[PDB]
């Protein structure tokens, strides 16, 4: 069976095809946008049919700086998708294989701005000829990342604050069950305080924060709060649970969400994988564990990855 997207210009004079609209990024390579444009030559007597891919950083200020632009001429001038579309359309169809290069930012929609990809196609007799709404056909497409196939190390981290007014410090350890969390799954913070000071642990505050680097933007997306006190010369151990989700995050204007075609509901933006070891929107999350003291601070942070699984 299989299905493919079509779109046309108001003139009904031009027709375009794609077989997907989410094109995956493997960090080591990015997939091609391999589509087929069907032409009506006679009405295309201008005789230069162009196809264009574009990565618009239409971020607010408002402005627009096109981070990446690609051009290809289809008429006058193959993957299996190309070949089957060409065979389906018979004769008067010509292809278009863009290859997005590595290192360009992911499809990101700031909560109403952001980065989105735009396949644009038209016919003319020169590239300098003016673009007009009567002739252009456009498709907004997405370029996204799935969670890694292999687990990393446990995101353990620690600290120790030798208070000057005390002989022995407040040793502390925080760890998550795993560094990868899928969307909708629960987080598990293992807080293992081992206090030896005269100060009293009043207030354990647990939060998951979004680090949107747009080329730093910080905002707490999940939050836990407890009066799990720790007594002087006493130890403590509790597994806190949290889960980031969009319900209580609507009002937070600006938070990065998964790229959207028109306006559909999408989850909080999956973490971006960096190439090996960058313009656009870079987003990452960390769990922050904060302990108030009194006799009023300590804290340790935990980088974790929040990303979708690869579809089945």
């Amino acid at each position, epitope marked *: 069976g299989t299905r493919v997207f079509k779109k046309a210009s108001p003139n009904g004079k031009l027709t375009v095809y794609l077989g997907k609209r989410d094109f995956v990024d493997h960090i080591d390579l990015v997939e091609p946008v391999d589509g087929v444009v069907l032409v009506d030559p006679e009405y295309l007597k201008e005789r230069r049919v162009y196809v264009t891919l574009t990565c618009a950083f239409r971020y607010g200020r408002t402005f627009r700086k096109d981070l990446f632009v690609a051009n290809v001429q289809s008429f006058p001038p193959l993957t299996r998708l190309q070949e089957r579309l060409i065979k389906k359309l018979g004769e008067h169809a010509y292809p278009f294989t863009f290859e997005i290069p590595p290192n360009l930012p992911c499809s990101v929609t700031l909560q109403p701005c952001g980065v989105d990809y735009e396949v644009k196609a038209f016919c003319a007799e020169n590239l300098e000829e003016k673009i007009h709404k009567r002739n252009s056909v456009r498709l907004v497409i997405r370029k996204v990342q799935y969670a890694p196939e292999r687990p990393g190390p446990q995101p353990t981290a620690e600290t120790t604050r030798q208070f000057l007014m005390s002989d022995k410090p407040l040793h502390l350890e925080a760890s998550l069950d795993k560094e990868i969390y899928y969307h909708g799954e629960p987080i598990s913070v293992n807080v293992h305080v081992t206090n030896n000071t005269n100060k009293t642990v009043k207030k354990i505050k647990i939060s998951v924060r979004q680090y949107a680097d747009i080329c730093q933007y910080k905002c707490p997306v999940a939050m836990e709060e407890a009066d799990d006190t720790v007594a002087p010369s006493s130890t403590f151990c509790k597994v806190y649970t949290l*889960t980031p989700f969009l*319900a209580n995050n609507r009002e937070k204007r600006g938070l990065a969400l998964d790229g959207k075609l028109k306006h559909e509901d999408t989850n909080l933006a999956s973490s971006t994988l960096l190439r090996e070891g960058i313009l656009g929107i870079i987003v990452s999350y960390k769990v922050k564990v904060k302990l108030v003291v009194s006799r009023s601070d300590v804290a340790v942070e935990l980088p974790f990855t929040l990303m*979708h699984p690869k579809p089945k």
Partner: antibody
Amino acid sequence: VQLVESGGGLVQPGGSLRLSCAASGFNVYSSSIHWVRQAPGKGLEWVASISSYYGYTYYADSVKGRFTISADTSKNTAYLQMNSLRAEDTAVYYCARSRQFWYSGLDYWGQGTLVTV
Amino acid sequence: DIQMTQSPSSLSASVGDRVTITCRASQSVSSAVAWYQQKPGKAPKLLIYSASSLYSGVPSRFSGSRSGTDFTLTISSLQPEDFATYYCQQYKYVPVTFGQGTKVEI
């Protein structure tokens, strides 16, 4: 991974009843919880559904205004506050669960409870 | 709101026979169609989703097929455990709608 329900019983029409849906092996934020009701001798019918992740509650017009769907966040359990019951609301009432990311058919159903008016 | 007329409502089939169920919608709902099985008294269970894909653990004789708006569930060889009532479901729009069911008998 399993769903189990209870709470059905004989009810005085015009009264109220609550069905409950216990979930094991998953969570209310990564999944969507549905109610499907089956009157005796008849086929299935969607009643209501909640996606706790987004804040969306959905209902059918055959039960709109009376039935209320909600979920207990701390214990993964769904509810159905059935106000103002009427005769045709007699059915076997099932809980259903489906994926939030992304809905791909109702995979986990419990055996449900029989509600009679 | 999408009506989902389903037919036939009941059919006779011996073991090893071929059975096809047709679910016809009042609109295109893309390929958003699911199929469920229900033995008498038991909870419904998913068989086919996205109108062609097979759910984890579902036997290989269950299959889905689409032609425009005539979504179809095809059972390759009816085993004695398959006798039940089958329900089609669009899930592209709210209010979500189920078919009237198709029961199978010997």
